[PDB]
Design a binder for these strands. Structure first.
Ligand SMILES: [Mg+2]
Ligand SMILES: [Mg+2]
Ligand SMILES: [Mg+2]
Ligand SMILES: [Mg+2]
Ligand SMILES: [Mg+2]
Ligand SMILES: [Mg+2]
Ligand SMILES: [Mg+2]
Ligand SMILES: [Mg+2]
Ligand SMILES: [Mg+2]
Ligand SMILES: [Mg+2]
Ligand SMILES: [Mg+2]
Ligand SMILES: [Mg+2]
Ligand SMILES: [Mg+2]
Ligand SMILES: [Mg+2]
Ligand SMILES: [Mg+2]
Ligand SMILES: [Mg+2]
Lengths: 86, 370, 205
RNA sequence: GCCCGGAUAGCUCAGUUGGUAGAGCAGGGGAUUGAAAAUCCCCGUGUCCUUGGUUCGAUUCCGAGUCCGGGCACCA
RNA sequence: UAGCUAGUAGGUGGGGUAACGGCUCACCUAGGCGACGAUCCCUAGCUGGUCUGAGAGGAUGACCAGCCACACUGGAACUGAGACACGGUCCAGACUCCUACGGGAGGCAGCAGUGGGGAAUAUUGCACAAUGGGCGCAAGCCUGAUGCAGCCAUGCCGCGUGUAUGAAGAAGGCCUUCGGGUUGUAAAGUACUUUCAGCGGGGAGGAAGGGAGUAAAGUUAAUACCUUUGCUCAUUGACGUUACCCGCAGAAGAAGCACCGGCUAACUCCGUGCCAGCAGCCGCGGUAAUACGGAGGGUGCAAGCGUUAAUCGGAAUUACUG
RNA sequence: AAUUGAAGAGUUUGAUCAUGGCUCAGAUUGAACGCUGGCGGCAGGCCUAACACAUGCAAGUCGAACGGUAACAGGAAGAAGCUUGCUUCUUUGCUGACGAGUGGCGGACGGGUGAGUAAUGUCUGGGAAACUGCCUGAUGGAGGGGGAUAACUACUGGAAAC
């Protein structure tokens, strides 16, 4: 990085990246809980998982990490799956 | 053996002084004659001696001691080395800013080149020594007083003119020469550049400057580095009064300068000089340095900046050669019309490479037969 | 840009009078107008069709003082314009400011006129014109500025003009040293020896 | 930087610590044809890289500069 | 180059994407493309256009403008509205540089520039004054975009290089039926003019904005502040001895290249000798050469002219027109 | 008013007509070389090595986002040689401002080149499943808590890079 700005951006990017990864990773984990529940065949549990995670997903979307559409999609798929289950 | 016991500088210095005393005709007419006339010093091999300024400085102190001795003895070559010293060493010293040593040289020379005028302007200097010294101590008195009172502190003194420089002024001012005014000189040597400007203003409050005789050589230094203010005021009994204001540092440089009737000699990154013919290029230089270097020579820098390969090297300027790991000489370098290699040898070397890359019959046959 | 040389040689080569000399003293007495220029002038050449066209082109160019490229450009312009191409070209040639001046009678020859134009002698609508090729449009007045009115050369030119035939499309004043370009010169106004058609043909091969 | 070698008819080459230079081709000139090829005759047709030295006499031997071909050294 | 292709063609479901999608995974069906040329190979940025051409076409894609692609090579993501980012990150590679040898740094296909390659293509120029961009409330700062400047006849265009007169048809040049006739009114001489160049002076336009003071209106508790609209005040130029105008002296400083047998505009005079040379094609040159070299004379173009390369034309010689 | 445009020639032969090639006359260029060579205006200027790159500059800005002051110019409290009047040396972001930083926006534009790509290309025309900073028009919110983190300081690991 020859230009100060680039250097700043680079370090910022690194910092930003670390931040986002943590959030995104967490979100993924949350999703997996729901998915795991679905796989198991535990409906109440699945619902609980969804409840736990949906808000987080929404928050993430709001922040910008994940896109609004993407956030919606997870819910839809998850919603569909849970519905199917019971 | 000098070089073995006192390093390369001291031998370079000894050899330059020996050059420019060119004993050649130091003995050789023995009235000192090529001490005198370079007669192209050791040719233009003056222009293959070492440039180290300590050459000229030991040469000057050598000749100065000699002119002291050429007050006393051998008669008519008192005449000879005085003509050398006027025409060569005194104006050399002056364009170096060694004003002290110009003025001693010139006074010795002149007093055995023209004894009549030397003696006549010497005697004239006594004839008004008293009215001169009295008016100098009254001017220096007033200046010492008002400036000290204003809180400024500096040396303030009179300084005699030297006999050659009086002579000089007398025939570039004949019949408007004044034995009094023209032989007074006030100097002020101040602590700071600030105080030079201050002493200028106080001087000008005490005695009116003359129009057109105010000359700021601190703002525009002369080629031998000479810096001062000059002003001519209108003093209380001297309808001119000459005054030189400066700092200590600029007095030290003004009196002691540098001490503070074919080929082109190119410097190298360290300092080891290389000799090429006139009209040579970077490429040629590279080749001279090493043919492998030439082969691998990418780019030519001169004094930091890049230069075109076609542009010819000027004498003295410092070179740098940017180099590759593989050797790749162009066939364009051989072709002389582009102006890449003036030297024959370099060209030959270049050619050799191509032949190497490439890798009579009758005679052989004859030999076989034999 | 111009032909710096023997004026009458060109005329001789062509055959006809190109008006390259003033006409104070006649062309037939000055040069051997009948004979072609050079050692082999008396040797009458059996001229080819292309050759004749070329000659014609040269004549016209010579008359106006228009070098080849310029001439070509003019021709092209004419072609681009509507109507008879040769006629258009001729008009364009005429429209040249220097030519116009010459016609008026401020230049004895066209060369003189051109020179005058160059030397900021001529004004069009109260504005100086350095350029000889300047196309003088309809209803454009053309004059000499007061600094160049006092020239005897101009007077001489005027006199010559007076002696010679008058153009119809121009109006001119001798005392004031000015005039008016009324309209574009028709084919009937210009000389009939100029076969413009040949020229046109030559710029179609 | 240094050395070694080479520099000869148009052009291939021959001849060297010293005696006015040849072999091939090419060229000439003749007969002969329009001119040729063929055939038949007759013929060197040269700045020995220039300039100096040595010698009773230099292509050659010594310089001195050129030119080319090497083979060596050089690192700013 | 006639066969090609298993994520291959399609399906159900999952996953993914900003988005639809074999985009990817699981399982199933066995397709899909193809002689209206798939596949493989070679070459290629594509378009507006440019050149040429009567057109139709053919060739072509520098400059300017649109779209794509790429950024030392090969990847990869991250950040972000947007990138898988020329002057960001991460890795590997080859290549230069630094290193105390442990490890680092670097990326001109930005503008200059250097080397190299080449037949051949410019200066490490000044400036943000404009126009545009970035940021900011602005002032402003940055802007090698841009604007200008430098270099090169590379092109196009303009202009000039004198104009008028001028027979002794001077001299000299060349020819030569020996008279001249040609250079040629060409030159000299005389008169007249001063483009640009030279000097000295003046002298616009590109400058619209922005800044302070104010007065009114719009906001609000408020005549403050802010915004909007007027006004005077000084301002804002890199180019810049700018464009442009004037005065001075005096033709002064401003013509060359090709061609001249036929094609093809323009011809005479040598040396040589099928030699030297010419040449686009036909062909010139073997002792009288308008073709080779010179001289004069001419012809063509003209600050260019030629040669070469390259395209269309002519070539209806790929014919769609034809 | 807005394509108002179309030429042949030489050369096969003893000569002819025809087929038929080669070939010249034109226009042209990012051109080059040759011989020249006054100037201006407007243009154009690495087509090859997308070969290597020394040097400088080509993207910074915002202090009215935020703690802070690394240089500077002003005041403020204290004092030195005290020209009776402030020059001067110490302290404090209090201010005009600003080094370095965090943050924001910009570095995805602008500029370059044409290597790759005969189609996740281009042109033309159609579309549907999309996102879109700043600019924008509209309709509603902007409450109340946290813990971090550079910056800055001591002790240190590294030749540096860090
Ligand atoms: Mg789905
Ligand atoms: Mg080259
Ligand atoms: Mg022109
Ligand atoms: Mg699906
Ligand atoms: Mg390509
Ligand atoms: Mg056609
Ligand atoms: Mg990449
Ligand atoms: Mg993102
Ligand atoms: Mg770069
Ligand atoms: Mg004569
Ligand atoms: Mg002028
Ligand atoms: Mg003819
Ligand atoms: Mg010829
Ligand atoms: Mg055709
Ligand atoms: Mg030249
Ligand atoms: Mg700051």
């Amino acid at each position: 990085a020859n230009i100060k700005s680039a250097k700043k951006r680079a370090i910022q990017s690194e910092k930003a990246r670390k931040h986002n990864a943590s959030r995104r990773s967490m979100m993924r984990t949350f999703i997996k809980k729901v998915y795991a529940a679905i796989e198991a065949g535990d409906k109440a549990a699945a619902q609980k998982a969804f409840n736990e995670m949906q808000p987080i997903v929404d928050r993430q979307a709001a922040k910008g990490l994940i896109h609004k559409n993407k956030a919606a999609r997870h819910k839809a798929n998850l919603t569909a799956q849970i519905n199917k289950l019971a | 053996v000098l070089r073995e016991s006192v390093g390369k500088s001291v031998v370079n210095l000894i050899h330059g002084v020996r050059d420019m005393a060119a004993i050649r005709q130091l003995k050789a007419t023995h009235t000192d004659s090529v001490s005198s006339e370079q007669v192209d010093n050791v040719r233009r091999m003056l222009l293959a001696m070492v440039d180290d300024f300590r050459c000229v400085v030991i040469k000057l102190a050598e000749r100065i001691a000699h002119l002291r001795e050429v007050k006393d003895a051998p008669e008519d070559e008192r005449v000879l080395a005085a003509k050398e010293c006027t025409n060569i060493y005194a104006p050399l010293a002056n364009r170096l800013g060694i004003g002290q040593l110009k003025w001693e040289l010139e006074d010795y020379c002149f007093r055995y080149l023209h004894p009549t005028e030397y003696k006549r302007i010497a005697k004239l200097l006594h004839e008004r020594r008293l009215d001169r010294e009295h008016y100098i101590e009254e001017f220096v008195g007033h200046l010492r007083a008002e400036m000290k009172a204003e809180g400024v502190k500096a040396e303030v003194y009179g300084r005699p003119k030297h006999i050659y420089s009086i002579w000089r002024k007398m025939q570039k001012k004949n019949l408007a020469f004044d034995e009094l005014f023209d032989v007074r000189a006030v100097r002020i040597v101040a602590e700071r550049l600030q105080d030079c400007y201050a002493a200028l203003g106080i001087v000008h409050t005490h005695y009116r400057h003359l129009p057109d005789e105010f000359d700021d050589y601190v703002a525009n230094p002369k080629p031998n580095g000479y810096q001062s203010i000059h002003t001519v005021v209108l003093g209380p009994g001297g309808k001119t009064v000459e005054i030189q204001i400066r700092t200590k540092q600029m007095h030290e440089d003004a009196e002691l300068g540098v001490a503070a009737e074919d080929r082109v000699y190119v410097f190298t990154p360290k300092g080891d000089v290389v000799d090429l013919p006139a009209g040579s290029t970077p490429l040629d230089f590279a080749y001279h340095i090493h043919s492998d270097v030439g082969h691998r020579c990418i780019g030519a820098k001169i004094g930091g900046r890049i230069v075109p390969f076609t542009y010819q090297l000027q004498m003295g300027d410092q070179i740098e050669i940017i180099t590759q790991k593989q050797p790749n000489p162009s066939r364009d370098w051989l072709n002389p019309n582009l102006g890449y290699v003036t030297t024959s040898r370099g060209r030959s070397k270049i050619h050799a490479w191509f032949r190497k890359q490439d890798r009579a019959a009758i005679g052989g046959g004859d030999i076989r037969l034999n | 840009a111009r032909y710096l040389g023997p004026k009458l040689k060109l005329s001789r080569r062509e055959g006809t009078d190109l008006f390259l000399k003033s006409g104070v003293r006649a062309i037939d007495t000055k040069c051997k107008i009948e004979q072609a220029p050079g050692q082999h002038g008396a040797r009458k050449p059996r001229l080819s069709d292309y050759g004749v066209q070329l000659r014609e082109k040269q004549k016209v160019r010579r008359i106006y003082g228009v070098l080849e490229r310029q001439f070509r450009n003019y021709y092209k312009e004419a072609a681009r314009l509507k109507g008879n191409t040769g006629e258009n070209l001729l008009a364009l040639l005429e429209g040249r400011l220097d030519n116009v001046v010459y016609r008026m009678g401020f230049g004895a020859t066209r060369a003189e006129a051109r020179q005058l134009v160059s030397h900021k002698a001529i004004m069009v609508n109260g504005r100086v014109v350095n350029i000889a090729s300047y196309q003088v449009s309809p209803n454009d007045v053309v004059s000499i500025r007061e600094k160049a009115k006092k020239q005897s050369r101009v007077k001489a030119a005027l006199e010559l003009a007076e002696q010679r035939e008058k153009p119809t499309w121009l109006e001119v004043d001798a005392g004031k040293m000015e005039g008016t370009f009324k309209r574009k010169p028709e084919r009937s106004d210009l000389s009939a020896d100029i076969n413009e058609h040949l020229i046109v043909e030559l710029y179609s091969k």
